[PDB]
Structures are given as C-alpha cells and as structure tokens.
C-alpha cells in the first residue's frame, strides 16, 4: 500500500472533493496508483464513501468506472437510500453466496428499499415444504 494510496484514501475519508478528483485525474493518465486498493481492515474507496454517506463522492467514483462488486449489498445493509438509487441505475466476499439483494433487503424492515427493489421486478424462491 503505497503512500500515494494512503493519501488518496485519507482524502476520500475526510471528504476532500477536489483532492479525490485530482487523484483520480492523475491516475487515468499516469497509472501510478490502483484505485481498487484495500486498507488494513479491507475497505475500498467505495466502501469508505458509502460508510459516510457521501453521495457526491459516490457519484464521482462511478464516473471513473471503479469496480463495484458487492457494493449494492453493503449499501442495502447500511440502509442508504440514495446510494441504492445510484447503484441500481448503473475475490473475498462478506456475504454467503446465497444472499441476493431482495433477501438481504427483506431482512431489514426498510420499506423504501424493498419497494424500490420490487418495482424493478424480483422474485424470492419459495422452498418446498416439509
């Protein structure tokens, strides 16, 4: 984890919009740092910007086509409505390979997200009774 990545992650964590944009611009032309990097606990830039609900940072990081991965599940578990709206209209995992967006949304009684998901059309598989 280079220092040029520690500076970038710190800028994302505080909320310095101009600095994060400058780092992203200097990355696409010099290819120095890897935007898909992990900090010691394992977070990426997307997770850091979602954990603080920084909608401007989240929108910016989508305009540079970062890796999304299980970023929708994290927003659903954190119950961030704006982040879910953004992520919808666009290897180590923390979730079991059987958890889908609608299931994980239904575990949390959040009416807004559940309605937002079922408006797009989903389906939960009924298990055969015994």
């Amino acid at each position: 984890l280079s220092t040029q990545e520690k500076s970038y992650l710190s800028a994302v964590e505080k909320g310095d919009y101009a600095s994060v944009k400058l780092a992203l611009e200097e990355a696409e032309i010099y290819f120095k740092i890897n935007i898909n990097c992990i900090d010691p606990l394992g977070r990426t830039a997307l997770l850091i910007a979602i954990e603080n609900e920084n909608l401007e940072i989240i929108e910016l990081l989508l305009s540079f086509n970062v890796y999304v991965g299980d970023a929708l599940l994290h927003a659903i578990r954190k119950e961030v409505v704006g982040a879910v709206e953004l992520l919808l209209n666009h290897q180590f995992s923390d979730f079991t390979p059987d958890i889908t967006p609608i299931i994980l949304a239904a575990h949390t009684n959040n009416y807004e997200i559940i309605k937002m998901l079922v408006q797009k059309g989903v389906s939960v598989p009924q298990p055969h009774e015994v």
Binding site: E13, K14, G15, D16, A18, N52
Partner: peptide
C-alpha cells in the same frame, strides 16, 4: 456511525469553503 457521519459533514463543509475562498 452517526457520530462519524456528523463529523464528516463538517469536514467536507470546511474543505469546500476553504477552497472557495482560495
């Protein structure tokens, strides 16, 4: 998490204003 949210709001506000006056 609420405390970190409320601290980050102030941080981003400060950065934006400082950059706006310079």
């Amino acid at each position: 998490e609420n405390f970190k949210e409320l601290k980050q709001d102030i941080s981003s506000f400060r950065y934006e204003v400082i950059g706006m006056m310079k």
